[PDB]
Write a protein that binds this ligand. Structure first.
Ligand SMILES: CC(=O)N1CCN(c2ccc(Cl)cc2)CC1
Length: 460
C-alpha cells in the first residue's frame, strides 16, 4: 500500500450558542450551504482528517463524540478513529481520522491557553492539537476570542497570547512558537471580528446581505483590515469569503439577523459579522489548496451558522535510508553564502543563528555575525560565508528537496531569539548558488529579514 503524497482535511468551526445541535448536521461535514461548497459527486468520499472546533459547546465530550462519529458514519460508511479531544470551558477541538491512518499518526499533543486577566479571565481562549502524519507535522488551533465590535485590539492581544503560550509540536524547536512548528497550521474558531460600520447602517447591511453583495461589507471586516495593517495573523492565508455573515441570527430560522441592543447583549449592537473563520499557514512551497469555504444554511440551533473549510495538503513519507536516520549521509550538504539578517531592534548585542530541521541530527549554532549599520537606521548582521555546512541525515533528493530549515537569530548576551523564519529546500537547482529569503518574526510580529544564497548538494 503506497504512502499518500496528498491528504484532505476538513476544518469545522461552530459557536453552538450553549444549545444542543439539531438531529442532522451532515450538511456541515459535506461543505453544503453558502460560499465555496464541495461538489455533490464527492459526498461519499471521506476526508482523511476531520478537525471540529466548537465554542459555547454545552455538550459533554462523550455526547459530542457520539454525534460526530455517527454523522460521519452516516455520510461515508466509515467509523472514524478519535485522534484527540481537548476542552477548555466551552471551547472544544475534536480530531477524527480514517482508520487506515491510525499507524501514520504519532506525537499527538493537546494544549489550551486562557486569555484575559481577572475580569477578562474566565471564558475566552484556545484549544489545540498537533501530531505527525508520516513525515508531515500538522497543528490545529480553535480559538474563541474577545466579543464586541469595539474590542478588535483585545482580539489581536488574545491572538498573540495564544501563539506565544500554546505548547504544541516538537518542544526541541524551543525558539519557535506554533507559527513555525508545523508543515501546515490551521487556525479557526469564533475569532469575533466584526463588520465595522455605523449602527444606523444595520438595515442597509441586511439589505446588502439579502442581495449577496458582500464587497462593501468585507471592506469593513475587522479581521481583513487588521491583517492588511499587519496587526494580526501575519503570514496567514484565508480563502475569499463568498457566504453571508454567520452572526448574529435569530435561532430556529436563518431569515433574520438579531442585531439590536438588548440586556442580554450588555446593551451592545451585534451588526451582521463574519465572526467564524478558518485561516492557515503552511511552510513555503508546500502544496495546500482550499477546496471549500462556506457556511451551512440548515443548522439553526445557534445564533451562529457553522463554517466549513476543506484543504488538499501535501504530506511526505517517513523516509529511511542505509545511512540516516541514525547517522549523516556524506553525499548531502546545505551551504549558505553572502547571508545577512536585517533586524528592527534598536539594541546593540552580538547575534548568532540557530538552524533547526528534522533533516539534521540536531540543531546547529553558527559563529556570531558582524553587525553593521544599514543606510536607513537598521541593524544588519553579516554572516558572509562564515555559516556552517549543514549535514543532512539523508541525501536522497526525493527526501531533501521536501525539507525546511527553521532559522532563529539569537542574542549572544541573552540567548533570546530576536526573530524566526523558515527556508524551503524545494530549490530550482542543486549544486547551484540560489537566492533564499524569509521574513523574521518574534511573538508573530515582523522583527526583520534573512536573505542570502543557498547551495544544496544531494546524491543526484
Ligand atoms: C500509546 C497510546 O496510547 N496512544 C494514544 C493515541 N494514539 C492514536 C494514534 C492514532 C490515532 Cl488515529 C488515534 C490514536 C497513539 C498513542
Amino acid at each position: 500500500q503506497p504512502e499518500p503524497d496528498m491528504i484532505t482535511i476538513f476544518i469545522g468551526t461552530w459557536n453552538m450558542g450553549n444549545a444542543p445541535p439539531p438531529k442532522k448536521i451532515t450538511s456541515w461535514f459535506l461543505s453544503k450551504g453558502q460560499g465555496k461548497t464541495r461538489d455533490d459527486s464527492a459526498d461519499y468520499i471521506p476526508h482523511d482528517i476531520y478537525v471540529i472546533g466548537t465554542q459555547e459547546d454545552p455538550l459533554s465530550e462523550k455526547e459530542w463524540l457520539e454525534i460526530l462519529k455517527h454523522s460521519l458514519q452516516e455520510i461515508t460508511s466509515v467509523t472514524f478513529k478519535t485522534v484527540a479531544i481537548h476542552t477548555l470551558w466551552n471551547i472544544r477541538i475534536v480530531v477524527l481520522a480514517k482508520p487506515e491512518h491510525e499507524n501514520r499518526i504519532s506525537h499527538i499533543c493537546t494544549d489550551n491557553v486562557k486569555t484575559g486577566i481577572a475580569n477578562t479571565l474566565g471564558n475566552k481562549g484556545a484549544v489545540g492539537v498537533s501530531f505527525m502524519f508520516n513525515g508531515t507535522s500538522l497543528g490545529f488551533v480553535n480559538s474563541h476570542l474577545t466579543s464586541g465590535s469595539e474590542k478588535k485590539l483585545r482580539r489581536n492581544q488574545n491572538y498573540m497570547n495564544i501563539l506565544r503560550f500554546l505548547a504544541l509540536g516538537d518542544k526541541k524547536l524551543s525558539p519557535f512558537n506554533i507559527t513555525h512548528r508545523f508543515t501546515h497550521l490551521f487556525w479557526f474558531g469564533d475569532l469575533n471580528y466584526r463588520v465595522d460600520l455605523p449602527t444606523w447602517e444595520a438595515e442597509t447591511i441586511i439589505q446588502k446581505i439579502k442581495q449577496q453583495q458582500y464587497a462593501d461589507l468585507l471592506s469593513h471586516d475587522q479581521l481583513l483590515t487588521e491583517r492588511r495593517e499587519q496587526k494580526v495573523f501575519l503570514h496567514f492565508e484565508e480563502e475569499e469569503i463568498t457566504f453571508a455573515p454567520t452572526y448574529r441570527f435569530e435561532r430556529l430560522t436563518r431569515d433574520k439577523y438579531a442585531y439590536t441592543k438588548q440586556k442580554a447583549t450588555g446593551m451592545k449592537y451585534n451588526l451582521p459579522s463574519w465572526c467564524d473563520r478558518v485561516l492557515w499557514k503552511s511552510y513555503p512551497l508546500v502544496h495546500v489548496v482550499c477546496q471549500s469555504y462556506g457556511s451551512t444554511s440548515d443548522i439553526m440551533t445557534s445564533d451562529h451558522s457553522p463554517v466549513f473549510a476543506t484543504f488538499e495538503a501535501g504530506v511526505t513519507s517517513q523516509f529511511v535510508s542505509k545511512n540516516g536516520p541514525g547517522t549523516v549521509d556524506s553525499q548531502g550538504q546545505i551551504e549558505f553564502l553572502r547571508c545577512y539578517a536585517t533586524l528592527k531592534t534598536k539594541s546593540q548585542t552580538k547575534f548568532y543563528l540557530e538552524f533547526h530541521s528534522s533533516c539534521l541530527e540536531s540543531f546547529v549554532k553558527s559563529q556570531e555575525g558582524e553587525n553593521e549599520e544599514g543606510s536607513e537606521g537598521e541593524l544588519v548582521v553579516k554572516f558572509g560565508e562564515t555559516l556552517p555546512k549543514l549535514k543532512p541525515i539523508i541525501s536522497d533528493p526525493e527526501y531533501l528537496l521536501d525539507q525546511h530549515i527553521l532559522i532563529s537569530i539569537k542574542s549572544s548576551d541573552s540567548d533570546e531569539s530576536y526573530g524566526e523564519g523558515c527556508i524551503a529546500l524545494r530549490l530550482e537547482a542543486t549544486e547551484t548558488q540560489l537566492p533564499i529569503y524569509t521574513p523574521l518574526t518574534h511573538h508573530g510580529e515582523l522583527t526583520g529579514h534573512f536573505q542570502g544564497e543557498i547551495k544544496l548538494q544531494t546524491s543526484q
